[PDB]
Design a protein around this nucleic acid. Structure first.
Ligand SMILES: [Mg+2]
Ligand SMILES: [Mg+2]
Ligand SMILES: [Mg+2]
Ligand SMILES: [Mg+2]
Ligand SMILES: [Mg+2]
Ligand SMILES: [Mg+2]
Ligand SMILES: [Mg+2]
Ligand SMILES: [Mg+2]
Ligand SMILES: [Mg+2]
Ligand SMILES: [Mg+2]
Ligand SMILES: [Mg+2]
Ligand SMILES: [Mg+2]
Ligand SMILES: [Mg+2]
Ligand SMILES: [Mg+2]
Ligand SMILES: [Mg+2]
Ligand SMILES: [Mg+2]
Ligand SMILES: [Mg+2]
Ligand SMILES: [Mg+2]
Ligand SMILES: [Mg+2]
Ligand SMILES: [Mg+2]
Ligand SMILES: [Mg+2]
Ligand SMILES: [Mg+2]
Ligand SMILES: [Mg+2]
Ligand SMILES: [Mg+2]
Ligand SMILES: [Mg+2]
Ligand SMILES: [Mg+2]
Ligand SMILES: [Mg+2]
Ligand SMILES: [Mg+2]
Ligand SMILES: [Mg+2]
Ligand SMILES: [Mg+2]
Ligand SMILES: [Mg+2]
Ligand SMILES: [Mg+2]
Ligand SMILES: [Mg+2]
Ligand SMILES: [Mg+2]
Ligand SMILES: [Mg+2]
Ligand SMILES: [Mg+2]
Ligand SMILES: [Mg+2]
Ligand SMILES: [Mg+2]
Ligand SMILES: [Mg+2]
Ligand SMILES: [Mg+2]
Ligand SMILES: [Mg+2]
Ligand SMILES: [Mg+2]
Ligand SMILES: [Mg+2]
Ligand SMILES: [Mg+2]
Ligand SMILES: [Mg+2]
Ligand SMILES: [Mg+2]
Ligand SMILES: [Mg+2]
Ligand SMILES: [Mg+2]
Ligand SMILES: [Mg+2]
Ligand SMILES: [Mg+2]
Ligand SMILES: [Mg+2]
Ligand SMILES: [Mg+2]
Ligand SMILES: [Mg+2]
Ligand SMILES: [Mg+2]
Ligand SMILES: [Mg+2]
Lengths: 44, 76
RNA sequence: UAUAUAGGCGUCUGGGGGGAACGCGGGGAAGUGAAACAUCUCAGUACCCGUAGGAAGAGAAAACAAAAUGUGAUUCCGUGA
RNA sequence: AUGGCGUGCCUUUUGAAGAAUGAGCCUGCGAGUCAGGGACAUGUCGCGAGGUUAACCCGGGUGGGGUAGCCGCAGCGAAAGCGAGUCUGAAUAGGGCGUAUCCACACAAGAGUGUGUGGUGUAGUGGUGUGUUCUGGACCCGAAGCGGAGUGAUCUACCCAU
RNA sequence: GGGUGAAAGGCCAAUCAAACUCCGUGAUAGCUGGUUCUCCCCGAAAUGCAUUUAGGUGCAGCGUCGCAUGUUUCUUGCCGGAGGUAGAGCUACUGGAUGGCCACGUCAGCCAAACUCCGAAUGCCGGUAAGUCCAAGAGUGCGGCAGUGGGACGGCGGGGGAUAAGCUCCGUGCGUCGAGAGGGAAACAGCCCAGAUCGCCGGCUAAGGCCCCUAAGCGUGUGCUAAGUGGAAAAGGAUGUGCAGUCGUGAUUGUGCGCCGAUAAUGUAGCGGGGCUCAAGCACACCGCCGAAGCCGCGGCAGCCAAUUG
RNA sequence: AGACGAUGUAUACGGACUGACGCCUGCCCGGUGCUGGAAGGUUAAGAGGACCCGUUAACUGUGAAGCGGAGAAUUUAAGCCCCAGUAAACGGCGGUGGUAACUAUAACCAUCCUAAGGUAGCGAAAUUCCUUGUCGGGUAAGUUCCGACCUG
RNA sequence: GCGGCAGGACGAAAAGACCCCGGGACCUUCACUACAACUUGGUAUUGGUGCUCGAGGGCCUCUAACCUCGGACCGUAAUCCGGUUCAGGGACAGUGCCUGGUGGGUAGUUUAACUGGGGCGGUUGCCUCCUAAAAUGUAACGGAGGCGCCCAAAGGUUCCCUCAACCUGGACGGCAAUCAGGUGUUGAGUGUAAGUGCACAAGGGAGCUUGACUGCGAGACGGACAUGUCGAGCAGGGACGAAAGUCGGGACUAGUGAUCCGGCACCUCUGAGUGGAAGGGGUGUCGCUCAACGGAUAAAAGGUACCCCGGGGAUAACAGGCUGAUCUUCCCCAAGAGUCCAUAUCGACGGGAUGGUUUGGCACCUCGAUGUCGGCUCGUCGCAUCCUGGGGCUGGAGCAGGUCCCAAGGGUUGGGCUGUUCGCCCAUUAAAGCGGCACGCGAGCUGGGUUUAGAACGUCGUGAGACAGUUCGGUCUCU
RNA sequence: UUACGGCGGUCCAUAGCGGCAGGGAAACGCCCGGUCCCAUCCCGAACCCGGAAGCUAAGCCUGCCAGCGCCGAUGAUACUACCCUUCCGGGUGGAAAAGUAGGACACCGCCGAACA
């Protein structure tokens, strides 16, 4: 199953993308760029 | 009591839209081509669709290089 | 059955029915339209019931309005649209 | 006398003299209408940056008033808003939609011609004619059936009294 | 939507799977029918897409009228392009596949819509020089009003069918009919010739014809055909016959006509009739004439355009 | 309201199927009904109203009282769930694979399956497709007819 | 002109009843959605003590509300209806409001289209190849296959690398594991169908990373429209790289669903007296096998032989038309069997036609009607001759045959069984021919068959009902 | 200028792949080592850095070979647009593939090298 996860900021849900529950558990933290205007780490 | 087949996809016009000596504006498209039959020369880009398109304005050639068929714009 | 009623008796006054449309109150369709069809429409229309009067209803703010801003019962017409 | 040539009319069809439909005949009646400050095109006429009144009141009438209102005149935006600008946006970054239009000059040079100073200066609106259209039966004829309020057992089905 | 029913959906005033009458009501119908005077100018479509849609309808395509733009449109010659069909080819791949030599390999002869080392003609897109140009009554943009959305057959390239059908579904700046009369094909929407403004008791032609019906040749020259072949047909069969080939007679190969095979039901009845070989048949030559509402001639009308006449 | 039932009272009245008489009426309670039982599970209204949210005297952003918006838990009844009865309730009634001392047949027996596997009686029938089944009677000749057989 | 006969005028009559199409009507049920009716609780009418399970419920009893179609009595010179009064029941029943359940008992409806007629079957959107006729585009129920995803790397970027197969040499270990070394230019590999591409790699490795970004976009492709598709370039702030540079997911094209109405977070946009709030609005995004995939509703199946109306020859059954696969009658070549001998007589395998008489294909005439199988009555024509008549050949002694050619003048029986046609049989005969003519002939006849309404049987269906399955009954109009 | 070394261009083999013999002056090469910068899914092989012992034996370069591969007319034919033809067939333009004649061991452009 490939569910629809929203990415939130540490400050401040701009985005949402498909990742799965089986191959990638402990849902992902990456990084990404509007309110702040810098690339801030985003967690699931 | 027959025909397991009888389906087809929409055609998608897919052909050289600009031939030979033509005046072609800067962003103007040419040869749509699935799977890059023609390769990009000097003043043509290639999109992520394998669609070619002009970079500069000028006159379209159709030449070749290293065996490959090439499209390119030369300036007026 | 007794305080009395229910009834009974005698007497005076009224009501009962008809009418073309308009009135106000209450019940209240369907075909139709939605290119089907239930919500919705047709329509509070047809039809029915009560009850009028020359007209009838409504009517004398437990009303509108938005302050440098006021109008002043109700009904009906034009516009807002 | 005779000779040449020549398969009704309408409807509906790929195609009808059709053996496809419709009419025995004649005379008379029988199908595109009218209402609304309706809507959009388009003539024509009044007045023009303005045009025009509706209820209504005064009249012997079709003639006088009556400025409430509607349309034009500034836009862009979801809106607050600001306005030849405005909106999205961090943005004298682009792009969207407006600035009547057509001219010269300036700059830019270019990726299809842009931005400005200067001149020119716009045309709508109210009657009425025609086309079509909206809401009404809306060009005329034709169902089987649906609902409402009544009328029927002197025919027939059954029961009751005699 | 009730009655009655020893039960059939029977009967309820000649009508009943829901009586009758009036009113809603001029109910509604993507359905069938009907719509009435004239002339002028122009003139379609039967396709694409979407559809509780396929016989309806929306938008585009094609028509018209008016306002813009003023040859861009169409045609032909040049030029610059991309293509993967026809054809061909395959130790050039991918399969299928025949016979030798020794499965492979080698030596040959192949086949293909979904095979391609190859590869046209035509069409297509652009640029350009003229032509048409008192016209195509063009092209493109915007608007008022449309209708059409059941096509048919013929030619050429295909699919489906049995390579059957007057079959069915497609392509084609393909034709005609639809919406085109006239002449030819005996008769005969789709075939050949040709586009009807009107009048004439005038000519010249087209396809197709010229013994008589029937307008014009019993036309002329050199051959063929004996079967009424001409005036239906096959696989085959055969000392019919005319010419040109090839080792006075036999074989042999081409080729022009001809013979048999040949045979369904009202009456000849497979020339349109008569009649034709004393060719009116067939083949190639060659002069003529006939023949249309075409073209021309003379005269009268009207539409658009540019100088009443063209 | 009242009426018929009925100026009747379970030997009566209403409904369902079957259809004089004779001999009979087998097996199935899974499904669906109907009848009873209710110990629990789930649940509607109505009660109940923790915790939130809006506003504002007080405190400079912090929140109690008034007022009113949202309303959770916890509470129940019949039904359904659940357990029984009932087939003259609606209905339902099996499969292949082997075996006898010549052949053939299968008393019998193996193994699946279901709630249970069609009993008596009848059978080419108002039921039988192949079909004018085959056999006997009737006829010079019987796709009909009558009597049997059973591959219903 | 008159008397007659009925073959035609696709005769007259009835806008076909069959068939399909779309409108209606009744009927059915585990279609949908209501409602009646029935039952359940709460709460009004509705009160008083008692005993208890309780975190207001369960019950006891009483009489005064309310009930009795129990009696007597009176209004009253009547089995109605009131009033009085004894006897009963009793805060229960009934009734109002609220509310769960059961609910074809009724009501309004729905129940797709394509389709070589309709039904049954199959199919419906998107991607790829061929049909497709060398631009693009292009039909069929033509021929082949896929999709409703997966990947936190299978993305980004900077580097480096070359495969499969094949031959030769090696413990386990072989025409398959790994090991070296040769020939090897594309066969291998590409997350996933096929095609177009890709060896310069888009194929195979590794290091760091998250551009699988935010605000935008000149210009074209493609299209009825709504969709869809490519995009240099500019800015912010980042990744990799020394740099130039590339990066807005993936070699490419399938992996998706318009609007409406809701859900969540975000923003000082508005806040119907004012200041707040509620609600609205914006930006970002979530909920549809709306798969019949441009989605008619949030919500829907069947029957009609009881049928009805509007249409159609746009579309079936009968007949005509074309076709001739299949049937039918001849024919070409002879492998053969006939003692030997292909051709007395049969003739396999294969090939070519005739006929339109069977089963079909097609949908051209007729649905504002071309009325129906068999039989009877009456025929008429063809010859592919059953008999009679004339011939050749014979594996023809004779008698009686066989086979082929010629010939259409006449003649070609009566019964049994079945609705039959056909067929089997019976007794005869010189012989018991085959076909066409709307499978000749119902304005000439019959009505047994088929094919309306009644009804039972077997079967399928929950049911209404259905069956080229049986069974018995069933208006034949016209001067 | 000569058998030199780089970096290119061609609608990329008439340039290729083999065969046989030649070349080393500067340069390109193999080579010589692994401390320094930098590397291996293991190895200083390769990628790097540091040097010049030993040689042209290989790469690279230049000859001469039609040995494979490639290029390829002319002339016919297939096919074809348009036309004419009552089936058949031809008329005026286009015109292949295949095979054949033969071509071919490339041809150019400006930057160095040692000798001018
Ligand atoms: Mg409607
Ligand atoms: Mg309608
Ligand atoms: Mg027709
Ligand atoms: Mg027409
Ligand atoms: Mg007629
Ligand atoms: Mg007639
Ligand atoms: Mg008719
Ligand atoms: Mg008349
Ligand atoms: Mg008539
Ligand atoms: Mg009625
Ligand atoms: Mg009576
Ligand atoms: Mg019945
Ligand atoms: Mg009657
Ligand atoms: Mg009714
Ligand atoms: Mg014209
Ligand atoms: Mg239209
Ligand atoms: Mg070919
Ligand atoms: Mg249509
Ligand atoms: Mg069509
Ligand atoms: Mg067509
Ligand atoms: Mg055609
Ligand atoms: Mg054809
Ligand atoms: Mg046709
Ligand atoms: Mg003459
Ligand atoms: Mg003569
Ligand atoms: Mg002559
Ligand atoms: Mg003849
Ligand atoms: Mg004969
Ligand atoms: Mg002449
Ligand atoms: Mg019975
Ligand atoms: Mg508070
Ligand atoms: Mg007579
Ligand atoms: Mg008739
Ligand atoms: Mg009809
Ligand atoms: Mg119903
Ligand atoms: Mg249909
Ligand atoms: Mg069919
Ligand atoms: Mg083409
Ligand atoms: Mg194409
Ligand atoms: Mg091995
Ligand atoms: Mg407020
Ligand atoms: Mg659709
Ligand atoms: Mg739809
Ligand atoms: Mg009818
Ligand atoms: Mg027929
Ligand atoms: Mg007929
Ligand atoms: Mg037809
Ligand atoms: Mg008629
Ligand atoms: Mg004969
Ligand atoms: Mg007959
Ligand atoms: Mg009759
Ligand atoms: Mg008759
Ligand atoms: Mg009968
Ligand atoms: Mg049953
Ligand atoms: Mg009888």
């Amino acid at each position: 199953i490939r569910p629809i996860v929203k990415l939130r900021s540490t400050a401040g849900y701009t985005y949402v993308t498909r990742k799965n529950r089986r191959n990638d558990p402990d849902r992902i933290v990456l990084r990404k760029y509007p309110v702040l205007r810098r690339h801030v780490e985003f967690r699931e | 009591s027959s025909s397991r087949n009888g389906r087809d996809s929409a055609a998608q016009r897919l052909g050289v839209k600009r031939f030979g000596g033509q005046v072609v504006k800067a962003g103007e498209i040419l040869v749509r081509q699935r799977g890059t039959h023609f390769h990009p020369g000097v003043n043509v880009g290639r999109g992520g669709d394998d669609t070619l398109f002009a970079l500069a304005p000028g006159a379209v050639e159709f030449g070749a290089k290293r065996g490959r068929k090439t499209v390119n714009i030369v300036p007026v």
